[PDB]
């Protein structure tokens, strides 16, 4: 019949996983007890986006809006434009599309319009330098996110273009059983509609915390001004720790609000990057969900991913339970033989997924 889920928890993931597995699902009791029950405007917007990038899908929303019945079709992709409601930035919509773009009949060329930054969702730089490198490790050679306009909250006005030229049969099998060595730290400090000195002061704070490290630190200053700078003023920073040896990366990001000091924000993100590194083994917590899913949809082979004891939190557990409900796949965790740390190897057998939408 349908695999039934509860609440709005992991709404995007469950829809994405159902699309990849092709298994019809039902999500019920979405915010039943709230004063405004049911789906939000951005969750309906996300369902419109799924309709546009697939064909033959049936999405039924209840009369009360508290139940969604999803019968997935085939991933087709193609060129389109999506207007993101102001309640969510573009990154809330681009992030799930990274799970579907490589396995499409045609190339994804989607133009997202609206706010390009927020406090809770992925930024442009997190996607460009933090998640999209992971896709490259798994076999997505050609994938890019072009920034046409920056739009800061609340008025936004930004514009980003997602192009994933690589259409692959499935992700490669991952074998990462070591702790990568960080070779350098990079990043982007950006601003819109405001003076360059805020970006400089962002960097001064970030260099301050990181200068004690033995590696090179090179943060870029992305000062947007003029017509392509959106409709609101704003600034932020995204620091990335890179491991050139095997193309792994760890990143942290945040944006500034009204009445905040740029130096303090630079110090905060610099401290968070060190916190993320300490909690990581091969990928960061904000990259782990993408890595796990891509390992599930590989060939019928055992992929290995080293994970730090800190990354097994409530988010990790709910992700694995959702995978087992949809895919019946169980992640097997074994300790590493070392005594320096308490890491574990997450071993996943792929399901033998194949991109059957692409013409041959």
């Amino acid at each position: 019949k349908y695999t039934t889920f509860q609440g709005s928890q992991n709404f995007r993931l469950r829809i994405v996983l159902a699309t990849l597995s092709g298994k019809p699902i039902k999500i019920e009791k979405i915010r039943s007890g709230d004063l405004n029950p049911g789906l939000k405007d951005y969750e309906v917007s996300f369902l419109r986006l799924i309709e546009s990038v697939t064909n033959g899908s049936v999405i039924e929303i209840s009369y009360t809006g508290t139940t969604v019945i999803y019968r997935p079709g085939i991933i087709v992709g193609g060129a389109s434009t999506h207007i993101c409601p102001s309640s969510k930035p573009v990154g809330y919509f681009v992030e799930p599309m990274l799970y579907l773009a490589p396995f499409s009949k045609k190339k994804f060329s989607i133009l997202f319009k609206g706010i390009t930054a927020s406090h809770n969702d992925a930024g442009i730089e997190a996607i460009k330098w933090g998640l999209m490198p992971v896709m490259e490790k798994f076999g997505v050679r050609e994938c890019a996110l072009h920034t046409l306009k920056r739009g800061s909250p609340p008025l936004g006005g930004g514009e980003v273009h997602l192009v994933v030229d690589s259409l692959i049969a499935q992700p490669i099998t991952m074998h990462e059983i070591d702790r990568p060595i960080i070779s350098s730290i990079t990043g982007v400090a950006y601003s819109t509609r405001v003076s360059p000195s805020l970006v400089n002061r962002m960097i001064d704070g970030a260099k301050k915390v990181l200068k004690n490290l033995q590696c090179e630190v090179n943060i870029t200053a992305d000062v947007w001004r003029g017509e392509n700078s959106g409709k609101s003023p704003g600034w932020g920073i995204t620091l990335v720790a890179q491991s050139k040896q095997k193309g792994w990366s760890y990143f942290a990001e945040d944006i500034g609000d009204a009445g905040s000091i740029p130096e303090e924000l630079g110090e905060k993100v610099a401290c968070q990057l060190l916190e993320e590194i300490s909690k990581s083994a091969a990928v960061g917590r904000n990259q782990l969900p993408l890595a796990i899913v891509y390992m599930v949809i590989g060939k019928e082979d055992i992929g290995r991913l080293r994970i730090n004891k800190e990354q097994i939190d409530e988010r990790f557990i709910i992700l694995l339970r959702d995978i087992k409900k949809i895919f019946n796949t169980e992640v097997f965790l074994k300790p590493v033989d070392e005594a320096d740390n308490e890491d574990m190897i997450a071993t996943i057998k792929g399901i033998g997924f194949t991109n059957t939408s692409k013409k041959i």
């Binding site: 789906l39 049936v58 999405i59 039924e60 929303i61 009369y63 079709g73």
Partner: peptide, 10 residues
């Protein structure tokens, strides 16, 4: 174009 979103919300 086959399939679609059937919105029944009040």
């Amino acid at each position: 174009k086959r399939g679609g979103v059937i919105d029944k919300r009040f």
